[PDB]
Amino acid sequence: AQKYEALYMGTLPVTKAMGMDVLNEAIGTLTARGDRNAWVPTMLSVSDSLMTAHPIQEEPLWQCPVRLVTFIGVGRDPHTFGLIADLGRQSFQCAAFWCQPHAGGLSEAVQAACMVQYQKCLVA
Template identity: 65%
Template sequence: QGQDLVMILKKDTMSLVDPLNHSLIHHQPILSIRVWGVGCNNGRDFAFVASDKDTCVLKCHVFHCNVPAKGIAKALHEMCSKIVAERAIASSGPPCTTTLESISAEDLPLQVDILEAVRQSMQTYEALYIGSLPVPRAMGMDVLNEAIEKLTRGLGRERWMPSLIHVSDTAMRVHPAQDEEAAYIWECQVRYVTFLGVGRDAHTFALIVDTGRRFQCAAFWCEPDAGTISEAVQAACMV
């Protein structure tokens, strides 16, 4: 049964609060959200998928909003971009403390250069490339899981290819681990990614891409799990 709630988006967390007694009903770290979307019921339905902290099972949370839900989606997009940029800047150099008053006009070009470097930075991950195949729809965990199962059943694990996955804010490229200079095995522009997620087995990660003529799903086996690469690709899609 539905429950009236107030959604609060602050810093890196989504909080759901009882509007009467202001008690906290649920809180969700924003970067742990796997996917979100706006429904077609006058644009006031909103949903997100995230792993339950107790059972580690993916759950879909659905809301009917009293305001257009695209505002929530836009706010989440902006918050994710900000969080990713702040983390990248923090990891790119030694810790420093800077107050607002200490930033002079001479500092501004440097700030712009740093942010541009963050956007162009590339992250690399090791994984086994299982393969890819056409899928009937652009979105859906059912589509993703069915594709993963078909690919894992079709080839023996000994034929999965050890790979290096390069993720930037514009593209995802997969190269053979033995020869990084060789031609890529698989590539997509992140703007064409329509859906991504972790499969029923937490080691599996897959994404669906719009190739123009059809939708293609590529799947990977990750160690120790697929959470890190899933978050990286999701963040790249939001920059």
């Protein structure tokens, strides 16, 4: 049960499942987008199990099970938060978001979620 005002700015495939550079290349190339700035404003829920990006005021428009998440972090630009998830069995995606108070608050929540999740599966 979370709450984060963030602008979903797309998802694209990435080479290796982790690394701050791999993440930045990804976030970076999603940022380099000269346009009318059409990133969808959303609201992120982060349960221990799932991450959801609902639209403002209506099922999700992007979601991801915390278990699939492999790497996370704030990019070279503190406004952005990116995350890589092992999707295609032997293949990785990367989603990014814009946050004005800054992406740290969100990031912390996502990490804490991954921690709980990981620990739940490690032992039984």
